[PDB]
C-alpha cells in the first residue's frame, strides 16, 4: 500500500514490453486503478505522486509537511516550467501495439510500502491428516496442516441451498464420522461389542 | 433494390450538443411543404454547415457477411458523398396522414416526416441512408 491506506495485493505482472509506456520510454513499476480513488477520497495520494515528480526532477525536497501553505497550483506551476503537463498527465502508448492511449495518465513516483502477508505463508490445503484426540477432528492452524472450520453460519447457507446430501458428508466423511452399538431395549451405548 | 425515398433538404440547425464527432441536424425539404428531417451526422467525416443542400436518399441494397469494399471489381450504388446503414424501429401516426419514421445507424438516430413513404418504407431491417452535395 501507499501511505494513504490504499491496501492492494498484487494481481498480475507484465514485462516492460507489454506495459504502457510514456513517450520518453518509461514504464510503471506499478499500475493501480482510478476506481480506488474517488469513493475513498484520498486526495493527498494524487498530490504526493504529483509532488514527487518535482522531487525526482529538480533533486529537491518533498515537503509534504501538513499545515504549510504548499498548493496544488504551486507544485504544478513548477512542473509546467519544468517540462510537463502540470496536473500529472502524460500521453502514454499502449504496450502491445504502440498505438497512443486515448486517455492520458497521471504518471507518478509514489512511495509505496511492501507489507507482511505474502501469499505463500497462508496457502493452506488439506485432504485429511492429523486429528485432535478428544473430538477426532481436524487439528487447528495452517501450520499444523490443519483444516478449515466449516462453522454453523456456513451450514445455514447449505441448508438455504437445500443441499442435504452434501452438508451430511461434509460433516461426517469430511470430519468426525464414527460407528457405535446401541441398545434395542434401553437405547444407550452400553453394548459391550465383543466383535469378530 | 432500388430506391425508396428521394428529396433535397435545407439544413436549418446544426446542434453539436456536448458531442465531438456527431451532430443533430434539422432540415426542411426545398420542394415539399409539410416535410421535415431530424438526423445524426458524423461531422468529423462530413462537415455539415447551416443551410446546405443535403440530398437525402434511401436504398436497400446495391444477405450475408461483409467484405472489405473492395473496388477490384466492386461498384456499390453511389455518386454519394456520405453513406450510413440503419434499422427501422418504430413507425408513427402524427395525425390524419402525417406519418413519421425512426431509424438507427447504430445509435446515430433519424426522424423523418411526410405521408408518401407508403409503397416505399415497409417495416424493414433494411435501409441504407445516402447523402450528397
Amino acid at each position: 500500500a501507499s501511505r494513504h491506506g490504499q491496501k492492494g495485493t498484487i494481481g498480475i505482472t507484465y514485462r516492460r514490453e507489454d506495459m504502457p509506456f510514456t513517450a520518453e520510454g518509461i514504464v510503471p513499476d506499478l499500475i493501480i486503478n482510478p476506481h480506488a480513488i474517488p469513493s475513498r477520497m484520498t486526495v493527498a495520494h494524487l498530490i504526493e505522486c504529483l509532488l514527487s515528480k518535482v522531487a525526482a526532477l529538480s533533486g529537491n525536497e518533498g515537503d509534504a509537511s501538513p499545515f504549510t501553505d504548499i498548493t496544488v497550483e504551486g507544485i504544478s506551476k513548477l512542473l509546467r516550467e519544468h517540462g510537463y503537463q502540470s496536473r500529472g498527465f502524460e500521453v502514454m502508448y499502449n504496450g502491445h501495439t504502440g498505438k497512443k492511449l486515448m486517455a492520458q495518465i497521471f504518471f507518478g513516483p509514489t512511495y509505496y510500502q511492501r507489507l507482511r502477508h505474502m501469499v505463500d505463508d497462508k496457502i493452506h490445503a488439506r485432504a485429511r491428516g492429523p486429528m485432535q484426540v478428544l473430538t477426532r477432528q481436524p487439528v487447528e492452524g495452517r501450520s499444523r496442516d490443519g483444516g478449515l472450520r466449516f462453522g454453523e453460519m456456513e451450514r445455514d447457507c447449505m441448508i438455504a441451498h437445500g443441499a442435504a446430501s452434501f452438508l451430511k458428508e461434509r460433516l461426517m466423511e469430511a470430519s468426525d464420522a464414527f460407528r457405535v452399538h446401541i441398545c434395542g431395549i434401553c437405547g444407550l451405548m452400553t453394548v459391550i461389542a465383543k466383535l469378530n | 433494390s432500388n430506391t425508396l425515398f428521394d428529396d433535397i433538404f435545407q439544413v436549418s440547425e446544426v446542434d453539436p450538443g456536448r458531442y465531438n464527432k456527431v451532430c443533430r441536424i434539422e432540415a426542411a425539404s426545398t420542394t415539399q411543404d409539410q416535410c421535415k428531417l431530424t438526423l445524426d451526422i458524423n461531422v468529423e467525416l462530413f462537415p455539415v454547415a447551416a443551410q446546405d443542400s443535403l440530398t437525402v436518399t434511401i436504398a436497400s441494397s446495391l444477405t450475408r457477411s461483409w467484405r472489405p469494399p473492395q473496388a477490384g471489381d466492386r461498384s456499390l450504388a453511389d455518386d454519394y458523398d456520405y453513406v450510413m446503414y440503419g434499422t427501422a424501429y418504430k413507425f408513427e401516426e402524427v395525425s390524419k396522414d402525417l406519418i413519421a419514421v425512426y431509424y438507427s445507424f447504430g445509435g446515430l438516430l433519424m426522424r423523418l416526416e411526410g405521408n408518401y413513404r407508403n409503397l416505399n418504407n415497409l417495416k424493414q431491417e433494411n435501409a441504407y441512408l445516402l447523402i450528397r452535395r
Binding site: 498480475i12 504496450g95 496457502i123 | 457477411s65 467484405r67 472489405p68 473492395q70
Partner: protein
Amino acid sequence: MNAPDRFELFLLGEGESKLKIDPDTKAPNAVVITFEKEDHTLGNLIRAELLNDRKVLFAAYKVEHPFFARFKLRIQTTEGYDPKDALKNACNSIINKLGALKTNFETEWNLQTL
C-alpha cells in the same frame, strides 16, 4: 512456489509443436492457428500484414490468458486462395521489409561520426 517456469515463454516443452492449424467451422473457408510460445511482438505484426493483402476477408489474433505463452490467429480468405498462403506471403513480406530496413539503416549508421 506455484510460480511457473521462467523459460516456458519460448521453450516448447515436449509434445507442444509450434504451429497447430485447425479448420474454423463457423464460416466457409477460414482457419484458426495456434502459435505456442509467442505473443503480441509477433501476433500483432502478422495480423497487420494480413491486412494489406486484399485477398484476406478477415484477420485477428488474441492472447487468451496472459499466464500462457500461446496466442491464436484466425484467418479468412476468398474462395480459391488457401488461408495458409496468406500467412505465407504476409510472412515473407515482413521478412523482405525487415531484411531491407536493416541494410537501409546500416548505410545510414555507417555515415554518422561519434
